[PDB]
């Protein structure tokens, strides 16, 4: 449908997969990355209904679907689940046959090496993909944005990845990597609303929950004062509307969640925070290069949207920094989805063509390949 | 009178013959028509049909649109054709489909106006908005301005 | 020669043209199976012969 055998891209998450084509500026679809099933007998008969739900399919018939997610803290456990999330990219939304286009996919430079070789192994013998390559996320964020030289720091649904890299290099001894992410805070959201009186242990209630934590909740640039205030006052509530017609309203668990970025210990996570492990990332790189990535705070990945982050970032690293320089962060409306928009412009680079791997050496090397070949 | 084409050239006539075979009960013999649009009803049972009788007044309304009274043989054979489409059925849906899939050269799902005008235009034929309107909204029974592939079928449907 | 190796490559490609078909009425056949049920959904209920005893006698 395409005029040229441009790239696929899909940036598969531990939450949801966007997919689009090389070249372009956005997606032409997102997923949930979720296969879902029912947990129920059936009834009725001659009603269709699934063995199995795909995407958005699972998601939208979930009221009697336990939904698994083959994706989690960035890595893939479940590949049958992820052929058919791929398939159902590839051949029902985006409506291409990989088998004429190469396709990139993503994943943080610690991520078990287990992810990258079954997603080469899954695009190259399901698919039957001409050529394969896996790129980094802060690779990706860094095209997104603008920027060589930077701190990546990616907060999103599976971990945080933490990268420094300078001049397009990685600094690999200074990745301050952190088993903490906005999975973390949905279950925590879900626990500290049940103790409002709204319990939420059920998949259809996870979901809503991660809908509540999308809309309402927030991190601000002072926990302290804004719990002084939230926990007082009704003043700084916000209500929510349930599928069924329930309404909740969230006070200071609105925040209190989110901040444990801030105060992993709140979820019984021993961590110092993904801000002092940002500051760690920097300072942990040789001193002519600290100067550099203290300019280039690059935020990217899922979180980055939560009202006072930005700020709260630069905040919290700027007071760890030393005086007289000046400490930035990069925090543009592309945050978290400059995964998915650098892939598109990775895989359209010139330079790139020499690092996509073709369906012949694959032959040769089988899906270990991915280890010789892309990083 | 043109609908008589749908009438008898997707029928035949020995269908006509057996029209005549289940009809002669009315006639009982040497007779040129004495039939009435009461057992209308009875005459369409005895065709083998499950019908309402809503339908049957229908009928007696979807004819008598000369104010007659009684049935004329086109659109009678064509409500048949329209309800009994016990023809030489018209078409092949490979046929019906290729069909498709040239006027809608793109496969778009359906065949808009846009191929329909395009075809219609390229019969020769003189085609207004009440031609490519009529053909599509026969087709698109949705009524979506434009007709999808079953819709072309059955708008394609007992067709010469 | 060159026979050969076309014979041996044009086989393989149409086996593939073959398999590809197979593939287009395979989806047929299932996007078809779901339009069946999205069609059925609509022309089940009337495919049943009505109001036969209700009166005669």
């Given at each position: 449908?395409?005029?040229?055998?441009?790239?696929?891209?899909?940036?598969?998450?531990?939450?949801?997969?966007?997919?689009?084509?090389?070249?372009?500026?956005?997606?032409?679809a997102?997923?949930?990355?979720?296969?879902?099933?029912?947990?129920?007998?059936?009834?009725?008969?001659?009603?269709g209904?699934?063995?199995?739900?795909?995407?958005?399919?699972?998601?939208?018939?979930?009221?009697?679907?336990?939904?698994?997610?083959?994706?989690?803290?960035?890595?893939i456990?479940?590949?049958?689940?992820?052929?058919?999330?791929?398939?159902?990219?590839?051949?029902?939304?985006?409506?291409?046959?990989?088998?004429?286009?190469?396709?990139?996919?993503?994943?943080?430079?610690?991520?078990?090496?287990?992810?990258?070789?079954?997603?080469?192994?899954?695009?190259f013998?399901?698919?039957?993909?001409?050529?394969?390559?896996?790129?980094?996320?802060?690779?990706?964020?860094?095209?997104?944005?603008?920027?060589?030289?930077?701190?990546?720091?990616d907060?999103?649904?599976?971990?945080?990845?933490?990268?420094?890299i300078?001049?397009?290099?990685?600094?690999?001894?200074?990745?301050?990597?952190?088993?903490?992410?906005?999975r973390?805070?949905?279950?925590?959201?879900?626990?500290?609303?049940?103790?409002?009186?709204?319990?939420?242990?059920?998949?259809?209630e996870?979901?809503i929950?991660?809908?509540?934590?999308?809309?309402?909740?927030?991190?601000?640039?002072?926990?302290?004062?804004?719990?002084?205030?939230?926990?007082?006052?009704?003043?700084?509530?916000?209500?929510?509307?349930?599928?069924?017609?329930?309404?909740?309203?969230?006070?200071?668990?609105?925040?209190?969640?989110?901040?444990?970025?801030?105060?992993?210990?709140?979820?019984?996570?021993?961590?110092?925070?993904?801000?002092?492990?940002?500051?760690?990332?920097?300072?942990?790189?040789?001193?002519?290069?600290?100067k550099?990535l203290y300019?280039?705070?690059?935020?990217?990945?899922?979180?980055?949207?939560?009202?006072?982050?930005?700020?709260?970032?630069?905040k919290?690293?700027?007071?760890?920094?030393?005086?007289?320089?000046?400490?930035?962060?990069?925090?543009?409306?592309?945050?978290?989805?400059?995964?998915?928009?650098?892939?598109?412009?990775?895989?359209?680079?010139?330079?790139?063509?020499?690092?996509?791997?073709?369906?012949?050496?694959?032959?040769?090397?089988?899906?270990?390949?991915?280890?010789?070949?892309?990083? | 009178?043109?609908?008589?084409?749908?009438?008898?050239?997707?029928?035949?006539?020995?269908?006509?013959?057996?029209?005549?075979?289940?009809?002669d009960?009315?006639?009982?013999?040497?007779?040129?028509?004495?039939?009435?649009?009461?057992?209308?009803?009875?005459?369409?049972?005895?065709?083998?049909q499950?019908?309402?009788?809503?339908?049957?007044?229908?009928?007696?309304?979807?004819?008598?649109?000369?104010?007659?009274?009684?049935?004329?043989?086109?659109?009678?054979?064509?409500?048949?054709?329209?309800?009994?489409?016990?023809?030489?059925?018209?078409?092949?849906?490979?046929?019906?489909?290729?069909?498709?899939?040239?006027?809608?050269?793109?496969?778009?799902?359906?065949?808009?106006?846009?191929?329909?005008?395009?075809?219609?235009?390229?019969?020769?034929?003189?085609?207004?908005?009440?031609?490519?309107?009529?053909?599509?909204?026969?087709?698109?029974?949705?009524?979506?301005?434009?007709?999808?592939?079953?819709?072309?079928?059955?708008?394609?449907?007992?067709?010469? | 020669?060159?026979?050969?190796?076309?014979?041996?490559?044009?086989?393989?490609?149409?086996?593939?043209?073959?398999a590809?078909?197979?593939k287009?009425?395979?989806?047929?056949?299932?996007?078809?199976?779901?339009?069946?049920?999205?069609?059925?959904?609509?022309?089940?209920?009337?495919?049943?012969?009505?109001?036969?005893?209700?009166?005669?006698?």
């Amino acid at each position: 449908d395409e005029d040229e055998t441009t790239a696929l891209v899909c940036d598969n998450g531990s939450g949801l997969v966007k997919a689009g084509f090389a070249g372009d500026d956005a997606p032409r679809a997102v997923f949930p990355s979720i296969v879902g099933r029912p947990r129920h007998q059936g009834v009725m008969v001659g009603m269709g209904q699934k063995d199995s739900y795909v995407g958005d399919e699972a998601q939208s018939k979930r009221g009697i679907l336990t939904l698994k997610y083959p994706i989690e803290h960035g890595i893939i456990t479940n590949w049958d689940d992820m052929e058919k999330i791929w398939h159902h990219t590839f051949y029902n939304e985006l409506r291409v046959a990989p088998e004429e286009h190469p396709t990139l996919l993503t994943e943080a430079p610690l991520n078990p090496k287990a992810n990258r070789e079954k997603m080469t192994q899954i695009m190259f013998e399901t698919f039957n993909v001409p050529a394969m390559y896996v790129a980094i996320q802060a690779v990706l964020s860094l095209y997104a944005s603008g920027r060589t030289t930077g701190i990546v720091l990616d907060s999103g649904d599976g971990v945080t990845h933490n990268v420094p890299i300078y001049e397009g290099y990685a600094l690999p001894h200074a990745i301050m990597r952190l088993d903490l992410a906005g999975r973390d805070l949905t279950d925590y959201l879900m626990k500290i609303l049940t103790e409002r009186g709204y319990s939420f242990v059920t998949t259809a209630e996870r979901e809503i929950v991660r809908d509540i934590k999308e809309k309402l909740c927030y991190v601000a640039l002072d926990f302290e004062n804004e719990m002084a205030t939230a926990a007082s006052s009704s003043s700084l509530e916000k209500s929510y509307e349930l599928p069924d017609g329930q309404v909740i309203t969230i006070g200071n668990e609105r925040f209190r969640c989110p901040e444990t970025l801030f105060q992993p210990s709140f979820i019984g996570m021993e961590s110092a925070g993904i801000h002092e492990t940002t500051y760690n990332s920097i300072m942990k790189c040789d001193i002519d290069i600290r100067k550099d990535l203290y300019a280039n705070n690059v935020m990217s990945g899922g979180t980055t949207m939560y009202p006072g982050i930005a700020d709260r970032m630069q905040k919290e690293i700027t007071a760890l920094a030393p005086s007289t320089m000046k400490i930035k962060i990069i925090a543009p409306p592309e945050r978290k989805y400059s995964v998915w928009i650098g892939g598109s412009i990775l895989a359209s680079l010139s330079t790139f063509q020499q690092m996509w791997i073709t369906k012949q050496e694959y032959d040769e090397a089988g899906p270990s390949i991915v280890h010789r070949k892309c990083f | 009178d043109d609908i008589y084409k749908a009438a008898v050239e997707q029928l035949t006539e020995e269908q006509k013959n057996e029209f005549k075979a289940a009809f002669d009960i009315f006639v009982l013999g040497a007779e040129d028509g004495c039939i009435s649009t009461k057992e209308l009803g009875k005459v369409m049972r005895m065709l083998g049909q499950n019908p309402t009788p809503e339908e049957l007044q229908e009928m007696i309304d979807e004819v008598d649109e000369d104010g007659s009274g009684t049935v004329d043989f086109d659109e009678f054979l064509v409500m048949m054709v329209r309800c009994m489409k016990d023809d030489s059925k018209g078409k092949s849906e490979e046929e019906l489909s290729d069909l498709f899939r040239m006027f809608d050269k793109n496969a778009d799902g359906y065949i808009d106006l846009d191929e329909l005008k395009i075809m219609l235009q390229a019969t020769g034929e003189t085609i207004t908005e009440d031609d490519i309107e009529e053909l599509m909204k026969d087709g698109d029974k949705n009524n979506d301005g434009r007709i999808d592939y079953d819709e072309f079928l059955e708008f394609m449907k007992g067709v010469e | 020669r060159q026979l050969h190796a076309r014979v041996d490559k044009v086989d393989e490609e149409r086996y593939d043209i073959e398999a590809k078909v197979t593939k287009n009425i395979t989806e047929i056949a299932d996007l078809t199976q779901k339009i069946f049920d999205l069609r059925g959904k609509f022309k089940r209920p009337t495919l049943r012969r009505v109001r036969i005893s209700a009166d005669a006698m």
